[PDB]
């Protein structure tokens with residue numbers, strides 16, 4: 315049974331038609347919009363990246379934070395340290411959700427080649443709902459230990475929001491967009 | 498499917514609730530140190546106490562083995578410690594994955610992809626593995642990494658380290674006093 | 680103690696016993712090179728023999744494809760291509776190990792990283808088509824070596840049924856310890 319899940323995910327990830335269907339669904343869930351037609355996975359990654367750049371810049375204004383772009387070496391200025399703390403917290407739960415669904419964190423679609431490539435793919439869909447805003451909220455608060463405050467706040471988001479449980483069907487929905495009968 | 502997901506939901510329940518997390522961290526402390534965690538200390542405070550005890554243990558080993566030492570830094574001694582702990586982290590990560598848990602959902606260490614690996618490995622690492630690294634560094638051998646690898650294989654085989662890790666993981670999580678899944 | 684625990688305990692028994700591990704490594708060598716390793720060689724010595732044969736194979740491939748070659752290492756275009764190809768193969772190899780029910784971190788030739796066994800299994804087959812493909816693409820002087828090589832390697836894995844064929848190879852490699860396989 316776990317083998318069947320892994321073989322399904324790998325099938326999707328290795329077929330260019332199926333990979334694009336999955337990436338299109340990731341885009342659709344991220345933005346609430348059908349993915350633009352006649353665009354490759356690389357083109358969709360570029361469009362997502364320019365929208366994300368714009369989202370960070372708007373959040374910076376909305377929280378009064380000085381900002382030129384996302385940048386980090388865990389370490390950086392306060393805001394970038396906060397964002398890293400928050401997204402790393404989310405990567406942990408996202409990995410648990412991927413494992414819960416029987417899939418491999420390492421086998422991605424938009425991201426590839428790293429231990430958490432599929433984690434990056436999935437976390438990116440939802441990270442702007444509350445996780446990245448919370449990083450900006452903490453940075454603006456400027457508390458004594460901002461990374462710890464981010465961790466505390468994100469653990470509470472995931473506990474209260476049932477993030478893990480909700481991610482599991484989301485991951486299955488993303489893969490089901492390949493239109494291959496799921497396990 | 499359902500069983501598989503239930504293990505992860507249990508681990509996350511424990512890790513995301515500040516009260517439950519502290520129960521797990523206090524159990525880890527007691528297993529590691531052979532005495533209870535000080536009362537009225539947060540996980541952050543316990544992490545600092547652990548860190549000071551770890552610095553003291555490295556100091557004591559360096560003094561006993563007669564090895565030059567200026568703290569943990571990620572010459573020969575730090576290379577040997579890294580080789581030894583990497584060996585331990587691999588069998589710990591494998592045990593965690595096989596137990597059905599997520600390596601990234603930790604308790605003392607939180608937010609790196611291997612946080613729970615560090616938590617579990619840290620319970621046992623100073624018993625034999627780190628002392629062995631000192632013994633080998635002190636010999637100043639021609640191939641220290643290989644010597645450390647072979648010694649660590651022998652420690653894990655002779656100590657039944659893997660067979661013990663899986664119940665250890667369950668014992669630690671069970672300290673949250675939530676019903677484990679099937 | 681359950682099927683997954685049982686498989687891990689089997690793989691770890693093999694990997695931690697110096698005699699069993701050498702039997703496993705000798706099987707890996709035979710599958711890789713199509714002949715038995717020399718008598719009384721240690722794993723370390725066999726790793727060295729593999730290294731020298733690999734150095735020679737890269738040199739031959741460079742000559743055959745007309746690619747400038749200054750050795751294995753962003754680096755030069757050929758090293759970028761080899762790295763993209765082998766990274767792609769690692770992903771499929773990890774999926775195969777996980778599907779077989781075994782641990783990516785518990786290796787035989789390579790030991791001590793989260794992907795040591797992945798590196799062992801990948802090395803058995805990587806010179807069949809994956810590394811030659813890296814040389815073929817490098818010879819085109821691609822502006823996008825990572826993208827082009829991964830496209831090409833996904834097609835190799837899809838068309839060759841690489842993941843499915845790796846599963847029995849992994850099981851056979853472990854079987855060479857002459858310990859009764861699980862269940």
Ligand SMILES: O=S([O-])[O-]
Pocket residue numbers: 375376
């Ligand atoms: O546009 S900013 O000043 O809120």
Ligand SMILES: O=S([O-])[O-]
Pocket residue numbers: 625651652653655656
């Ligand atoms: O220290 S080990 O050999 O039990």
